[PDB]
Amino acid sequence: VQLVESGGGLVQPGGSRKLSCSASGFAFSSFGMHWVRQAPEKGLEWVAYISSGSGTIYYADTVKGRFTISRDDPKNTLFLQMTSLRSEDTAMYYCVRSIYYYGSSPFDFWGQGTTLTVSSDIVMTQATSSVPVTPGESVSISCRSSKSLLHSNGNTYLYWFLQRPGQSPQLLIYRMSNLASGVPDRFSGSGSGTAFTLTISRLEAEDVGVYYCMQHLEYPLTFGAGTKLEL
Amino acid sequence: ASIAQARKLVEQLKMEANIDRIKVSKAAADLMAYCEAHAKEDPLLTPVPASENPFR
Amino acid sequence: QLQPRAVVALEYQVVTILLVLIICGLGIVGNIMVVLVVMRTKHMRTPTNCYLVSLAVADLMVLVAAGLPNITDSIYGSWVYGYVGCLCITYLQYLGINASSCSITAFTIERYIAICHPIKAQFLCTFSRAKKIIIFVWAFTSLYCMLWFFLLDLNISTYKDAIVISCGYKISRNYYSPIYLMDFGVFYVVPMILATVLYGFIARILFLTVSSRKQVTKMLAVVVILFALLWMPYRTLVVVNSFLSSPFQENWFLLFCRICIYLNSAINPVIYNLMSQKFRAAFRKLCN
Amino acid sequence: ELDQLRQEAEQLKNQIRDARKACADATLSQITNNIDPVGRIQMRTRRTLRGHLAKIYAMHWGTDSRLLVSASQDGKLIIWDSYTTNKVHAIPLRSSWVMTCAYAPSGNYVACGGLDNICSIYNLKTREGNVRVSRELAGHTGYLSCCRFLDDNQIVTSSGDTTCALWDIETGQQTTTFTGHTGDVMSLSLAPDTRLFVSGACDASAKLWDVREGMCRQTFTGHESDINAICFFPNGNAFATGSDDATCRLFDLRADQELMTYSHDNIICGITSVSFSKSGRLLLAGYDDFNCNVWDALKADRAGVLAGHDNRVSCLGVTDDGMAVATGSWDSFLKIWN
Amino acid sequence: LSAEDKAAVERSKMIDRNLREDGEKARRELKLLLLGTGESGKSTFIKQGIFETKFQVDKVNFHMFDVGGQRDERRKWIQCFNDVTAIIFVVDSSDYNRLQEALNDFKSIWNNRWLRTISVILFLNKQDLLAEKVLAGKSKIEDYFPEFARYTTPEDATPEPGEDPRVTRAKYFIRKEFVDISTASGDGRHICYPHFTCAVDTENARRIFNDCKDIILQMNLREYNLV
Known part of the structure; x- marks a missing residue:
């Protein structure tokens, strides 16, 4: 592809x-x-x-x-x-x-x-911007929403994207709990309605990019400010 | 030759005859116990309310 | 005119009432019978059943909306209903008598296509096509009968001793030649000519199991003759009256024409469903 | 030579019949007569699935109790979202004469087959975004009857010959062949532990096979005509068979005997599909008279009638959680009952 | 309700459009089913697992199916061939040893519960070999059928202008057997159409087209309330 x-x-x-x-x-x-x-x-x-x-x-x-x-x-x-x-x-x-x-x-x-x-929209807030990290440790990235993303059909609409330096964004987690294909089992997500968190275990050198928080409940789609992990 | 088929049928009947069978009453009691133990959590036998019905 | 009205001598009374009750009741039970049989049985989704329920609803409309006011007009003499009564009841009268004719026309055309062009009919005649034809029929007839809404009235012919109210025409009778001539034309001569020509084509196809070819031709003949003969008196009376100086009422010819109407409506279920094998098998599976 | 073998076979059959007679200490109906009846079951159609344009011949539920696969003579498989009646996928088939369809327990693959003698396995989760044939299983000499997945890699198929097969999807080879039938094998049913399975054929008999050894274990008789459907009990110790003699029969594995017979004087038509409830209390059978009947498994009384299909009810299915029952028939409609 | 739900139902509507288009395309063909034994020549009688054959007569598409490699004793896959236009049965003539087997197969198909309303087009292939067998003697159909000793050819029906009287009697007896089996039951819902053909005939497609027109005409005579 x-x-x-x-x-x-x-x-x-x-x-x-x-x-x-x-x-x-x-x-x-x-x-x-x-x-x-x-x-x-x-x-x-x-x-x-x-x-x-x-x-x-x-x-x-x-x-x-x-x-x-x-x-x-x-x-x-x-x-x-x-x-x-x-x-x-x-x-x-x-x-x-x-x-x-x-x-x-x-x-x-x-x-x-x-x-x-x-030369009425949904605000997706990632309060933390830069988190120093050490390989082998576990970190968590939080996300907050102005409106609850839990639908009456039982699905929440949260998407986690990773953008390595000099590369295009890459999908990690969709619907807060479903791991994307090709993503190692280190990443995991949890949350409820408004508060969300992305959990990373056994940090490696390939997780140095910027993490983004997206919603898909209604148009227009909104992203987060972005959290950067620095070794 | 049909001798091989006859031998195969005889061997199959011999290996099907030596089966440790239990009485019909014991199996009926087991089936009744299984049905009574799972009488609940059976939406077809015991209908669930509309709030618990995904096909409402 | 003369004050004391021409009174029923209580033979006209009884004869009229009994014949109307008999014809209308038998026709009503037959049409309800065909509708119930096709709706309760599982495998009546064929286009034929669409056409025949259209014809059954049209015949029920004619019966319940045209024959039953005859009982009241006989017992009482006047039109005891109201202005909205004349408008609605007469809209229903005309809508039925035109929708029956259109349903007959469309069913004749599909009989022709199915018998003379079997493979094209198999690839073409579906239930959705039948539904489209039927809804077009009903809409284009309801428009015409709204045009009837805008022209009715209650006419009062009063004797100095007693009064008579029968709902009639808003304007003079001789201005109704367009409506009645167009009615005559489409709803009488196009189905009559179409039936003769197309059923003759069907017969020449059938003549060239011969036992299956025997009774079908006489059934087609009796359908054509019944349609033409039973519809001629009313339509011709209605067209002739629009060109006379003073029309022809006479109270015994109008009975004749209306009885012919109700007999056609009561006879249609017998000749279109009961004489078939599909309907009889459905009635047997349904009603033991 | 042959006379001695025939006499020995007859003596063995007599001995096994005597064993069954000696093990028949009581009747199930006599024991269950004191059990209160289930009453009247009134199931209403909740979803009607439209889109098929020919006779539906097979259906299979998914493990998540939402996704549903159906097969029809127009030559296409459709995967349905039963909650929203949406069509997730529409898979064209090379052969329009499809008689079976299966849904993998992992939800990754579907299988189908029929008069082309080939079991085709389709990959549903691909990076290209379309459904593609993984491989075509070949080797059967008769029309492919029902097939069922063991896991993502093993599948058990029944053919128009008198044999069943176990396949390895990774290599596309027949690992084990199950022989012993004398007629066309029509239905399959897998045990919950996936260690045993039963096959119903046109010899009016059913057989119990073990997967890992490939040896027939038990043989069950009693039907007077062709067996068309078979289904295990939820506990895995009994199974029910439907046939063309207007009779459902409940069989036992441990006692190796006929246990209960389900029949009515007003039913003269054959049986197309047989299924159980979650607890095994209700036995649901599709019939040739366009209707589906609910039978009390223990008391052998009719509990309810499912009506609303204009043609032959060809398949039955009950979800794993037991919430709903899906029926498919020859009128190109599938209805979900609850 | 949700955006993903709307996108999913739009995808479902697109699938519905594709299914409707494909069904409309596949609707406009007539399906025929071909049966007969090895002796029949059913493989070569129209010049133009599952075998596939397509031919067109008068801009009408026919789709003929042949089931090979199975067992001809018990045929339970007939139920998936219901609602076909016609069934084509080819009989190997001039083979007196298996004429009884062919008659039994025709009787079994005619009385099948799934083919009560399906007509059968019957072909008696390679009548030529029948002609040399009945003209050269030393092969008595009397031995295989005892009814061929009081049977006389019908006075009404006529043979070919150059055909010998001896060929016609045998042909009419063989056709009469199948006609008698056909008329023994069926209640008039489905009928049989006998046909005499050889290996070099090129008019079999027209025969099938005419028989299909007759079949559909008889079907619409009952579907539409005429008979």
């Missing part, structure tokens, strides 16, 4: 530029797709979403009316049309895969990303 994105560069304010992401190694038509914005020295932000059959399209409030998302099924590529660019859009843009059936892990694969340079 490979996602290759292209179309970035330096754009003067008020211009227009189109981003494209090429997909291979999986059934593109059966998966929904997102666009996620990283910011230069800030956390992740959600941009847009298109469904598998393009029936439903969602946009962030900061890009509504100026950004357009489209999907090409015969030619497995995804397009993001940007109009009326401001200096606040200078960031790195990621394409994220999603399928959304019962028992699935939506935000499973992320793209490499493209660097673009110009």
